[PDB]
Amino acid sequence: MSNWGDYENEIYGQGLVGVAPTLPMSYADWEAHAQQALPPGVLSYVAGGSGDEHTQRANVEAFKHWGLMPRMLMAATERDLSVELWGKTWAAPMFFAPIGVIALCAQDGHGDAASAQASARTGVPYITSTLAVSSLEDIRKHAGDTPAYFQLYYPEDRDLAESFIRRAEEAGYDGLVITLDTWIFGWRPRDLTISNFPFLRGLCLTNYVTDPVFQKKFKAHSGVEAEGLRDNPRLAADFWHGLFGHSVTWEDIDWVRSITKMPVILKGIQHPDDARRAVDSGVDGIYCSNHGGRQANGGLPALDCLPEVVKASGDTPVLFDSGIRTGADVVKALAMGASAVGIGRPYAWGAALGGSKGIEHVARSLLAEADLIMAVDGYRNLKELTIDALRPTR
Amino acid sequence: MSNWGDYENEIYGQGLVGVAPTLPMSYADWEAHAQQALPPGVLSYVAGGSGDEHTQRANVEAFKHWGLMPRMLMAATERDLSVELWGKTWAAPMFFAPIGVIALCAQDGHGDAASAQASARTGVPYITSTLAVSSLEDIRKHAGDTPAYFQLYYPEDRDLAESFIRRAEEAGYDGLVITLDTWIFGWRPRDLTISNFPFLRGLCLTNYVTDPVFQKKFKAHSGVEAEGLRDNPRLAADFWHGLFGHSVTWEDIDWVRSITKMPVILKGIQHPDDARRAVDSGVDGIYCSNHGGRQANGGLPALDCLPEVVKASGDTPVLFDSGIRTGADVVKALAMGASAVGIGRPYAWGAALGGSKGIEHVARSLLAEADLIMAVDGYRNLKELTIDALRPTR
Amino acid sequence: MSNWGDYENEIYGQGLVGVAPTLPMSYADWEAHAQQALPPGVLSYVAGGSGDEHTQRANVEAFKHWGLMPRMLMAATERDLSVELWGKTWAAPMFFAPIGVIALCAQDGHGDAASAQASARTGVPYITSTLAVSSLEDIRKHAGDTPAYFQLYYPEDRDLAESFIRRAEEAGYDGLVITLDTWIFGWRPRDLTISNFPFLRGLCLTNYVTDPVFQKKFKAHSGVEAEGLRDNPRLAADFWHGLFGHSVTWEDIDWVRSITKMPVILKGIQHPDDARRAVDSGVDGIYCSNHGGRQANGGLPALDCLPEVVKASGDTPVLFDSGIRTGADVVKALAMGASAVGIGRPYAWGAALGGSKGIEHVARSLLAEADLIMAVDGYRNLKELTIDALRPTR
Amino acid sequence: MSNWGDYENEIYGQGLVGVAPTLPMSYADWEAHAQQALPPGVLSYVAGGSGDEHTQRANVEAFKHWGLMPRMLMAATERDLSVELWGKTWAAPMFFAPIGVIALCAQDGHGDAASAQASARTGVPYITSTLAVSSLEDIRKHAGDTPAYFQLYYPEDRDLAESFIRRAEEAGYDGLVITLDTWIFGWRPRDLTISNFPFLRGLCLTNYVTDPVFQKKFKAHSGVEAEGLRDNPRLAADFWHGLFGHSVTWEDIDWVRSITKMPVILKGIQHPDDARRAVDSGVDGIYCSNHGGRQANGGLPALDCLPEVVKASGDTPVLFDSGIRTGADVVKALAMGASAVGIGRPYAWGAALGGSKGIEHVARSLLAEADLIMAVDGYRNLKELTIDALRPTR
Ligand SMILES: Cc1cc2nc3c(=O)[nH]c(=O)nc-3n(C[C@H](O)[C@H](O)[C@H](O)COP(=O)(O)O)c2cc1C
Ligand SMILES: Cc1cc2nc3c(=O)[nH]c(=O)nc-3n(C[C@H](O)[C@H](O)[C@H](O)COP(=O)(O)O)c2cc1C
Ligand SMILES: Cc1cc2nc3c(=O)[nH]c(=O)nc-3n(C[C@H](O)[C@H](O)[C@H](O)COP(=O)(O)O)c2cc1C
Numbered sequence A, B, C, D: 001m002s003n004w005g006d007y008e009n010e011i012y013g014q015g016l017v018g019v020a021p022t023l024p025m026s027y028a029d030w031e032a033h034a035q036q037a038l039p040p041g042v043l044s045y046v047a048g049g050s051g052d053e054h055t056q057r058a059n060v061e062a063f064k065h066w067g068l069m070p071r072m073l074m075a076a077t078e079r080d081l082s083v084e085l086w087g088k089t090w091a092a093p094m095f096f097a098p099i100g101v102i103a104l105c106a107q108d109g110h111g112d113a114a115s116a117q118a119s120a121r122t123g124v125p126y127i128t129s130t131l132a133v134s135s136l137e138d139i140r141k142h143a144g145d146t147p148a149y150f151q152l153y154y155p156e157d158r159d160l161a162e163s164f165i166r167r168a169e170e171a172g173y174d175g176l177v178i179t180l181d182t183w184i185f186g187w188r189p190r191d192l193t194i195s196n197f198p199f200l201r202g203l204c205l206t207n208y209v210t211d212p213v214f215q216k217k218f219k220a221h222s223g224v225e226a227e228g229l230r231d232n233p234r235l236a237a238d239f240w241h242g243l244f245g246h247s248v249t250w251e252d253i254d255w256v257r258s259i260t261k262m263p264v265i266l267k268g269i270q271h272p273d274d275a276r277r278a279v280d281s282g283v284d285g286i287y288c289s290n291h292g293g294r295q296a297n298g299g300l301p302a303l304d305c306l307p308e309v310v311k312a313s314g315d316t317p318v319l320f321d322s323g324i325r326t327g328a329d330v331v332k333a334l335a336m337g338a339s340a341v342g343i344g345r346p347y348a349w350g351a352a353l354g355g356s357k358g359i360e361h362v363a364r365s366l367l368a369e370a371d372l373i374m375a376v377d378g379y380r381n382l383k384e385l386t387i388d389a390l391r392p393t394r
């Protein structure tokens, strides 16, 4: 931290000695260049959302309709952007949201590792998807000293789900995010046009391929032993697909909580009574998301739901993602009451242009801007950033 | 059904064996490609609407301003999208809206037949226009086991109108839709620029040319017998035009109802007191439509009128069309209280690119998306999709 | 049919009674619309050529650098465009060039039969590829009275080769065209970018799966009998790929001449020594072609090669294709000494937009233009249109 | 590796099991994507040429004005594209041309090592620039069994020159290429507009900072010892600029031949007298090149100079670069008498998109196309592809 905004001193300082930037500085340039730098299947998969993508787009537009009220003569010369979440201190109110194909957003095929390493160097927590090229144990090592969270895609096999949760607790993950909006895949025209579904080609199934329950059950089903599977994951792509997506129930969440000491955080919550029942049932975190609009095109921007989710959540921490493109967006979601803000699409572009360093550049750019907005506009820390600081705007 | 969303499994499954899709997956691609695939007169006629087309466009824009609220932990793993309408069970809350030139949207000139056959294979009901290349008797056969409805353009000859209704009841049609907003043609710049009016060239007049009353009255008027007319329908285009468009009255609707046992459904209703008087007079169905904005450019999106039409309609079923482009749209209109949702322009593009199979692909794409939206967002059946599930959006 | 130019009076007669054309009237508008009416896989394969397609384009450009000299006061009010080829009288100095995926250029998937049907109606002869959806026996049937030719892709199996030739003879084809420039597929970036290759999916292999030799050999190689092959031709696709491409040798031509009475015509000849040597072999026809630039991007426009191929072939007829887009191109290549001119890409676009009638329209438009130019510019028949009527042009 | 053309069967085999390509398949799409995947400084420097870049463009255009004559019935079913150069057998008549910033064209900043690794896997020889990030000793190691060449930028310091040459010999390079057309940098508007010049920032100077002569001389001139130079090469950048560019003279060539056993190859020759005089000096190779139009915008396409440089050089091998974008260009320059052909800009785009594998893909695509053209058009080996197989074309 020192302050996050300091990052611009280094960019400007390097220019004075004839060293120009090598990466873009804004989302639009990140996206413009990344999309052309990626393979076409990956582009379709990462850029593409659900239906005509109105929701994915509305998520982003929502942020143009709040404004922060600037406060003069506050002298917010030292900012404190840290947040304490479930016992751990985060250096920044921001985290890498789960991205199951981030491995493939990077030219070397290890974008997930690259993401965890960027987390290690910045202190921006990495939330690893269940889908991945590096196993969740290797990820947690790459994440260093920085808090790391495990996002569970809950499978149709209780033994496997518990193996994932156990392995995550044993690997030293700091919390468990259960994604509630992706037990089945939404209608995605960009991927359907080219019949692009990479997991069914055996990509990003390392966490299944390495899991003892999956290995045992797939051998029972196919005759294939653990070595043959690891050498050709695609052999178990159809088996993966059959068990991948369990539709999670309230009773499931009570079960998960009783078998692990990790805090449980539910991702996909939009409705305040869903947030109410979760919190009243002892769930530890509420993660307001609509999955980037990638999974259902119902039209409701995530950000429209965050205020009532915050109120219903009470002192239970609320995470927010879906539509964050800049540091401005990050400040506005924090002001509405999110404790920490997830970053998706922007760091996938980071990966496409620069690997671990590109990801690190996105994270640091987003936080520099947020911190400089708080300084100029007179908010010295996140406790002072309250929802009454924002104003609706045409 | 099984579930309609299953359709995407087949697309993805075929790609895994090197079989790419051959048709588009989204409305914008349907429209972009269809419009270039059609003859220029047909394009002008099918794409074109009334005046500067603000209404046609506003119909579609309206849907961007409602959002479905996602419900988590509902486990809507088995969806029931069936609807019972006037005694018959529909497998889907969706139907092919009447399109008088759909015959000509297909390269082989039999787009109407093609539409009825797609209905037969999907269970999406076909509503055949009075205007058509296949006679209403052949259509009903092509429709198989699937409910089929007859849309009457009520002529200025009571004998003819009753012949159409009798023939439709005898052919086994399951209801009668009287279109109230097209007794006279609205100002249509795209067609006027090129003086394109295909019916006056004797196209799509099969139901008149085959009708005994029309044959008798046209011979009385012209001397032409039934064979000469059937070999040159254009001989009776001017006669058709003189009788085509009777302005329907309340008393007419009471007359129609008393001469047939088919349920009567009125299409074009926008105003709730019009819906009130209809329903209080015993009409069986209310079909909220503004005819795609093709006929009057007054500016009122159909969807803006559907909520008050639903309330005034009570337990009388309400059909909705005008502006549906995607499965998202379909869910939102159902949530507002329509019992079934009509599809227009999208399946005309289906016909232009793939005939009966293209039409079937549009229908199945629309329903897959709607069903997957209901699953992800936690609505298990249409009874659970209530208007309070929607939220207005900027 | 008094002269081909009369076709225009039909198009103008119909507009006078308000019947507008439904198909485009120039190659540019056929290509534009047709390319949007096609599935992306068919588009890529039909439009795409070899390499960066310079040769494909340069083939077309070459026609811009010859001009026909108009001759006034010749009164060419009656034109004879007939040509006598191998003892049959062609109504038109034009033919449909072999296109192996033409079946798939038409929405109903039988564009090959539609091409034969258009040839039966126009008098424009059809040359069926070895690759097709309809058997070569049924193509000949569909071609009516119009002379029809069979284009052989000589396979790596003399038995199969001989059964193809004996079948074509027995089906009553009037010539055997042997394609010499596709025993191996060239670098085609459009298809490679999406790994598009329809034959390996068992598409268009009917002439192999109907063949008793192919059946026998494929059964020995796989255990699958003829009915199962008829119902899943893809079972045979890798076996087809193994024997498809035989690099034809001089001695093979000798061997083919001796087992058929059909005239043998060699397609792909570009160099005069190759032609002179063919003609001294006793080859019956020379088919000057570079396959539309689709197999090899060597850069030599096929038209640059025609004059010297005509001269080296003496009395033997020379057919020409590669770059013909209009009836002006037709006239020019005839003028250089082509006895008959082949159309490829234009009639594929015809199929994509009108099926049989779209194909017929392209053919009658090309011949209407060619005839009208001869009429206006003073060439009453093909004997008067010689290379001395052309001038090189900037 | 039976023939280079087989590469295409891999790309098509993978699509059949739903594995789509991830890299582009033509130069146009490499350039388009790659230019967007690069930092703007690398883009400017790699894409930019001298002046208004007419020469850079005209080098490429010249290949559009030669066409290869196809020869039918030659049965070139086995092709020999091998070439013997200075007592080593090249698997391919193609090599990676020297590119001093290739390291920076790859996201990991070691594109020079990745190029050598692609050469070790392909058999396509690598020519390392004097400018590089990896030492010339490590480049040779990375190149495995594949012949490797060292490109000398003769410095203004005979000691340093001689240590470079002795190092390359000792590292086991198989030739010394001396670049003659860059002892001073030309007017490059793209770099000048943003004052872009990576060497003066101490980038790509490893071969100088690893060099004992450079160290000694630079230490006398500044007091900085070798370790500090290793860690801040920019300390030496102005000193590098002072001795970089020596205008090589005839006597210098003489002096170089005498202190190495390596074959000496002169790069930049365009005029026949310069070549004839080189060959009579006893120079071992002629490298016809205008540096891709990057140093001087004089306007003469390098390809216009090759035929007469081949003739003036008699038995001495001639290498060719400048304008090669596809395998068609490769074939044409070989046909004019180039014994081997160099690739520049295409493999830089390869690095920017795939690193080593992107480079390998460009090289195998170029050679697949070249081979397939020879196969289709009847040239079984390089001895048969002569200038008499080409025709000038409009
Ligand atoms: C390519 C991609 C893949 C995704 N992968 C997953 C995943 O594996 N797990 C998950 O819970 N969410 C998934 N996310 C959703 C993110 O976690 C986050 O909800 C979303 O990206 C926020 O939307 P935005 O990128 O539009 O801001 C994915 C998002 C993207 C862009
Ligand atoms: C080309 C075309 C022709 C039409 N034909 C008729 C018809 O014969 N009968 C009728 O009641 N409505 C007619 N419809 C209206 C549809 O039944 C429906 O009201 C309308 O298309 C819905 O608007 P949308 O296509 O913009 O969604 C027509 C619509 C189109 C697009
Ligand atoms: C889609 C397509 C497929 C082809 N398939 C065949 C074939 O099966 N047999 C053959 O000898 N040539 C084939 N060719 C070459 C054509 O017969 C003809 O030589 C070529 O199309 C002429 O060039 P143009 O289409 O650029 O005018 C094909 C051409 C096209 C456009």
Ligand SMILES: Cc1cc2nc3c(=O)[nH]c(=O)nc-3n(C[C@H](O)[C@H](O)[C@H](O)COP(=O)(O)O)c2cc1C
Residues within 6 Å of the ligand: D045, D046, D047, D056, D059, D097, D098, D099, D100, D101, D129, D130, D131, D151, D179, D267, D289, D290, D291, D292, D293, D294, D321, D322, D323, D324, D343, D344, D345, D346, D348
């Ligand atoms: C970015 C770049 C840097 C260059 N650097 C070198 C170099 O270090 N040494 C050299 O002899 N030539 C160099 N050249 C010239 C190339 O070796 C080759 O002659 C040239 O790229 C061929 O032209 P083309 O790239 O337009 O085909 C370079 C070329 C490029 C594109």
